């Protein structure tokens, strides 16, 4: 199940970075972690 | 408090001076009173 | 069913998973109720046919 969770994170990660090649640069390596952790649980909500 | 005892007749001592001579003899150092 | 403390002792103390599995499948038990109670269920039969004339 740990392998499965890692592959799930993997799918989300390469999907997102293929979506946004711009900040796919390693500069946002910690920023893309903040976004993948958010996208791996549910959808982010605005205030409205 | 309490009362010291000595089973010699069993003498006693209070903080009057009882002596429950086996009967009774409430010495002094006369039971005419009543609480209120 | 009553379990002696040895059973879950060997279960929990066992680090391995299938070691726990062996401790579980091998553990025994006892039943005090077999020396105290004998339970049975009965229905008091009927003696009048539900559709007959006397009914």
């Amino acid at each position: 199940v740990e392998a499965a969770y890692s592959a799930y994170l993997r799918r989300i990660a390469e999907a997102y970075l293929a979506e946004h090649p711009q900040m796919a640069a390693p500069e946002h390596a910690a920023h893309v972690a903040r976004v993948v952790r958010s996208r791996a649980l549910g959808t982010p909500l605005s205030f409205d | 408090x309490x009362x010291x005892y000595x089973x010699x007749x069993x003498x006693x001592x209070x903080x009057x001076x009882x002596x429950x001579x086996x009967x009774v003899h409430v010495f002094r150092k006369x039971x005419x009173x009543x609480x209120x | 069913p009553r379990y002696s403390p040895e059973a879950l002792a060997a279960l929990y103390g066992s680090s391995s998973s299938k070691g726990k599995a062996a401790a579980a499948a091998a553990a025994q038990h006892d039943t005090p109720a077999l020396r105290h109670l004998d339970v049975s269920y009965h229905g008091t039969g009927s003696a009048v046919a539900p559709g007959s004339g006397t009914a």
Partner: protein, 39 residues
């Protein structure tokens, strides 16, 4: 209390819930509705 407690004592359902098993019979059609958007 209960019976067989010993065997009772021995994936990502926690992240995306359980799968509903009363709606398998529609799966096929759903796939069609994704291969032919013009419908």
């Amino acid at each position: 209390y209960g019976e067989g407690g010993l065997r009772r004592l021995l994936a990502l359902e926690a992240v995306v819930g359980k799968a509903p098993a009363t709606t398998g019979r529609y799966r096929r059609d759903l796939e069609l509705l994704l291969a032919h958007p013009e419908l």
